Design a protein around this ligand. Structure first.
Ligand SMILES: CC(C)c1ccc(-c2cc(=O)c3ccccc3o2)cc1
Ligand SMILES: [Zn+2]
Length: 207
């Protein structure tokens, strides 16, 4: 049921998605080990992911969360990087996309920093890098991230598939050391995220 619509680079919607991608790059404490050394990306394509059944699955669950939280879905747009992006865009998020060893338990993880999600495109810790060159910092191979609509509801604040903490719909990992890191988030129901945009890109070698 999924169809992909290409956005023109002249479209305001392409431009605002690119800006979120580029402006949320940061340096990582691994010095680029997992995701590569770069300060910006070359955006190659931005596609809208359209699937009626998966959308309705998302909005059904969003209403349930909203009704449990004074009519407030607490909806965000967040990045997700995964070796399973093709499964996700066709069949939705489910328990097979959960980070089983994540620091906030077995759930599906999302990031404000695009560069954090970039660290997972080739797997946990960057795996062995790109399939073709076995390079986690490959500047040639095309990568894909998802920019996702995510329902947080009442989020458990952690300063720093399972179930949400009792009385909560998600977990927030608040950075408590790296002053420049943005928040990361975990949901425990695949129906709480819709993979809105598929972004194809390369990391760029700093000059
Ligand atoms: C290969 C397994 C299934 C997997 C594990 C973690 C991720 C993932 C993806 C993210 O975008 C992310 C963002 C912030 C913190 C952790 C994150 O982890 C994706 C797939
Ligand atoms: Zn490569």
């Amino acid at each position: 049921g999924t169809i992909l619509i290409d956005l023109s680079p002249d479209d305001k919607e392409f431009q605002s998605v690119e800006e979120e991608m580029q402006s949320t790059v940061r340096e990582h404490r691994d010095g680029g080990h997992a995701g590569g050394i770069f300060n910006r990306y070359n955006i190659l394509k931005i596609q809208k992911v359209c699937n009626k059944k998966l959308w309705e699955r998302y909005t059904h669950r969003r209403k349930e969360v909203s009704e449990e939280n004074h009519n407030h879905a607490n909806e965000r747009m967040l990045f997700h990087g995964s070796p399973f992006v093709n499964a996700i865009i066709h069949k939705g998020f489910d328990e097979r996309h959960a980070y089983i060893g994540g620091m906030f338990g077995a759930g599906i993880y999302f990031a404000e920093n695009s560069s954090k999600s970039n660290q997972y495109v080739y797997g946990i810790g960057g795996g062995t890098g790109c399939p073709v060159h076995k390079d986690r910092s490959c500047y040639i191979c095309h990568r894909q991230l998802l920019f996702c609509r995510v329902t947080l509801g009442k989020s458990f604040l952690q300063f720093s598939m399972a179930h949400s903490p009792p009385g909560h719909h998600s977990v927030t990992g608040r950075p408590s050391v790296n002053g420049l890191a943005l928040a990361e988030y975990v949901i425990y129901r695949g129906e709480q995220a819709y993979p809105e945009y598929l972004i194809t890109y390369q990391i760029m070698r700093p000059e």
